[PDB]
Structure 1
Amino acid sequence: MRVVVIGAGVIGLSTALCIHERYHSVLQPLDVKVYADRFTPFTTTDVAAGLWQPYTSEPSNPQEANWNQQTFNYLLSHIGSPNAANMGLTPVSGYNLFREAVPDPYWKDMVLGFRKLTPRELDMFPDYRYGWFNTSLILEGRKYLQWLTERLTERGVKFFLRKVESFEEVARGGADVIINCTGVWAGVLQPDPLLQPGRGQIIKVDAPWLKNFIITHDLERGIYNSPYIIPGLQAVTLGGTFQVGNWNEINNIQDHNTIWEGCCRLEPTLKDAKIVGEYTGFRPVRPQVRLEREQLRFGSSNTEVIHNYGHGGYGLTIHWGCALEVAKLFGKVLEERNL
């Protein structure tokens, strides 16, 4: 059947692969195509700090906790292959610092080695007073997007640079099923007032001596509104901004300065780091991932649409669980159509 995925960010590509991986065998004819108006390096995914770490607060949908877990185990299963770095993966250990005691995250047990910092540890970070340590994984968005792209391409999936104006337009094109993985732009194909851009700028820097991630938190100020430093495969990502409702896509000088000075304070050796670039992107903020099936009549054609968007500051961290869930709904769509 004709299936069309709209989106080429981590959600779209992982989902496409996930399904094709499960159904090519079963459905003889299984035509996947991917439409997107932006491919890496232009997706929001390419801008991601690259770390696997859910929010500190519990999720609204409890399945989100599963999805996160399934994603981590799936990623860990690759640690050990010769390809892990080629897919954009590597373990990284690091700190979560806070200004005051805070309850353990629901994810303490998903990551490896979770534990509270000791005082000699905290002495390395004077403004903070409570914190955790745990090892997790890095999944660079750009590298991972390219990897999924080659995998998809070899499985025969086709890509097309296109801006979709409506699902109708796609249904008319003969799509039996359509997977919406439009990220913050999903509202355009169909309004969702719950969805909003969580803008964030980052500064990429060359500072190889930094081997661990460090993430600061300011409870008053909101998540990701505080300095964080996260080593990646080739460079370090400096960061710190999450602004809901802001659509400005231009890097701004003010954000740059606050991110730089904050990090520079937290890790003074940054003094010698070479800045390699700055970027801004929109977390697709929503109270809960919208992941559900919906049918659409276009005259005489029910065309299923399965949504998968609204991942906020955690799309990398949970993409696999969602891709699986979508495969499952797609499974139902198949049994209704009688395979």
Structure 2
Amino acid sequence: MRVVVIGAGVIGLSTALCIHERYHSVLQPLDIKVYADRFTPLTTTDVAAGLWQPYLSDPNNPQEADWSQQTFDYLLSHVHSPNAENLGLFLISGYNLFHEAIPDPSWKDTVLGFRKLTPRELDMFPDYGYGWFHTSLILEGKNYLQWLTERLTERGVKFFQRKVESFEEVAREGADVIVNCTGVWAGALQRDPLLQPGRGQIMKVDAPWMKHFILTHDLERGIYNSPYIIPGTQTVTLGGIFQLGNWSELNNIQDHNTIWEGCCRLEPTLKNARIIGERTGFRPVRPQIRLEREQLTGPNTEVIHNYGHGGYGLTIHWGCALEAAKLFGRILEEKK
């Protein structure tokens, strides 16, 4: 059995690992390769703060809510483990702020200690009149990707830096299953008008007195088009940019200004915080995650798609990897 995973973001690397844990014992030659054009630290995954939080509104596929909840339990189960530091994993609480009242999120019982904000809390934020407080987790993609890499290396998974041109090129080399975890670029392998860049930009800032995340929302502007402030391990992520169809992988001054002045107003102690770096990335936006089998091609090759995780790839990755690992088990039964 020869398996080629395309993509070394969190989606491909976690899928690779999951497929290996569940089937190395029962497939005598289980040879897994990863083809990726970019590795950490140059993926979309490395740009994310890594806060666990799905979108506010229920997903078009209800099984995504389970995949997120399965990811949360796995990560929470390891947050006190000694190797949590190597994962870039830790607990964090904070605020979601709104101008108007709004229905409670579908994941209110996935997170810890969910509640509405008391009136004295909403006084610290003049421009906002309603919101939530809850405890979640941060999984910083860069530590995590490096962790996944070294786990798959000790399991025999080999890594190759190449741009794949077609599915059929990979099948020609003799792949049996192709796992397609190509993120926002999946359209180049197979046209998909439902997949779109959601361009984001973030600032990384030294502000270690900040112990809480703070996400604000403007419901007439789209999600993550309002300031947010997410403390990481070494640095504080400042953000609030979400632009559909924008493929420019290049930091933009206007967006820099939007992030800075938006966050500084939200939390004035930021004014003196030092800017450590700035980064742009492309959420793979789709109305739903594509996570499903497809049979292509010459004499036929199995493909497992797993892309389109928008702005919640880190939040939902483990449930997705588990599901793709299931789809892989079904391929093996069909192949006898």
User: Does the alignment reach a TM-score above 0.5?
Assistant: yes
Alignment pair present for 1:6 and 2:36: no
Partner Cα distance (2:241, 2:194) in 1? 20
Offset, 1:218: 0.2
Deviation for aligned residue 1:49: 1.8
Structure 1: 4+ residue segments shifted above 6 A = none
**C-alpha deviations, 1:295-327, integer Å up to 9, x for none?**
11x210x11000000000000000011101001
The answer to whether 1:249 aligns with 2:249 is yes
1:79 Cα deviation after fit: 1.5
Query: Superposition pairs for residues 15-94 of structure 1, below 5 Å?
Result: 15-94=15-94
CA distance in 2, matches of 1:81, 1:65: 25
Partner SS for 1:119: coil
Q: Give the corresponding residue for 1:316.
A: 314
Q: Deviations over 1:174-211 (max 9, x none)?
A: 10000000000000000000000000000000110000
Distance 2:79 2:248 in 1: 38
CA distance, structure 1, for counterparts of residue 221 and residue 79 of structure 2? 35
* Aligned match of 2:298: 299
What residue identity is the alignment partner of 2:97?
A: L
2:335 aligned to 329, 334, 337, which one?
337
| Aligned residue runs from structure 1 range 122-137, under 5 A | 122-137=122-137
CA distance in 2, matches of 1:294, 1:318: 22
State the 1:85 CA deviation: 1.5
CA distance in 2 between counterparts of 1:307 and 1:232 reads 31
Structure 1, unmatched stretches of 5+, are none
Partner Cα separation in structure 1 for residue 234 and residue 329 of structure 2:
39
Q: Once structures 1 and 2 are overlaid, which stretch shifts more, 257-266 or 79-88?
A: 79-88
Distance 1:202 1:12 in 2: 23
Q: Which amino acid aligns with 1:228?
A: Y
Residue identity opposite 2:282 in structure 1:
F
Residue 220 of structure 2 aligns to a residue whose secondary structure is coil
1:116 to partner: Cα distance:
0.4
Cα root mean square deviation, aligned: 0.5
The one-letter code of the counterpart of 1:149 is T
**Alignment correspondent of 1:325:** 323
Q: How does 1:87-166 map to 2 (within 5 A)?
A: 87-166=87-166
Give the number of equivalent residue pairs: 336
AA in 1 matched with 2:311: G
> What do residues 258-295 of structure 1 show as CA deviations (whole Å, max 9, x unaligned)?
10000000010011111001000000000000011001
Instruction: Show structure 2 runs of 5+ residues with no match.
Output: none
Cα distance in 1 for residues equivalent to 2:287 and 2:202: 24
Secondary structure of 1:86's aligned partner: helix
Deviation at 1:80, TM superposition (A): 1.6
Shift of 1:224: 0.2
**Residue of structure 2 in register with 1:190 after alignment:** 190
Paired letter, 2:144: Y
1-structure distance, mates of 2:168, 2:86: 38
Looking at structure 1, the residues matched to 192 and 157 of structure 2 have their Cα atoms a distance apart, in angstroms, of: 29
1:317 aligned partner, one-letter code: T
Distance in 2, matches of 1:56 and 1:8, equals: 28
Q: Which amino acid aligns with 2:139?
A: L
Counterpart mapping for 1:272-291 below 5 A: 272-291=272-291
> Shift of the alpha carbon at 1:252?
0.4
Offset at 1:254?
A: 0.4
State, as a whole percentage, how many aligned pairs show the same letter.
85
Alignment-mate amino acid for residue 112 of structure 2 = L
Question: 1:201 maps to which residue?
Answer: 201
TM-score (norm. length: structure 1):
0.99
Q: How do 1:253-264 residues align onto structure 2 when only pairs under 5 Å count?
A: 253-264=253-264
Q: Distance in 2 between matches of 1:303 and 1:82?
A: 41
Q: Tell me the distance in 1 between the aligned counterparts of 2:298 and 2:98.
A: 56
| TM-score normalised by the chain length of structure 2 | 0.99
Residue 50 of structure 1 and its aligned partner are, at CA, apart by 1.1
C-alpha separation between the residues in 1 aligned to 2:80 and 2:114?
A: 21
CA–CA separation in structure 2 for the residues paired with 1:177 and 1:332: 12
Give the Cα–Cα distance (whole angstroms) in 2 for the partners of residues 25 and 233 of structure 1. Answer: 37
Deviation at 1:105, TM superposition (A): 0.2
